[PDB]
Amino acid sequence: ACYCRIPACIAGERRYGTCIYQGRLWAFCC
Amino acid sequence: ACYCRIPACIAGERRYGTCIYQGRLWAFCC
């Protein structure tokens, strides 16, 4: 599945969007 | 697992914020 991460997507993943959660933005990673 | 769904989470899914992904806003549902 895809994940929300901070600060960034990790090795093995790439960014395909942004999440909004708990007052901050997150990378959306798959 | 968690997934972006539209327009809302279903059944027992718990929302963890919002996806900004693929031209749309989604509920992020676990």
Swiss-Prot record, chains A, B:
Consequence recorded when altering W26A: Almost complete loss of bactericidal activity
Phosphotyrosine PTM positions: Y21
Disulfide bridge positions per record: C2-C30, C4-C19, C9-C29
Sequence positions bearing ADP-ribosylarginine: R14, R24
Protein name: Neutrophil defensin 1
Covered range of the whole protein: 65 to 94 of 94
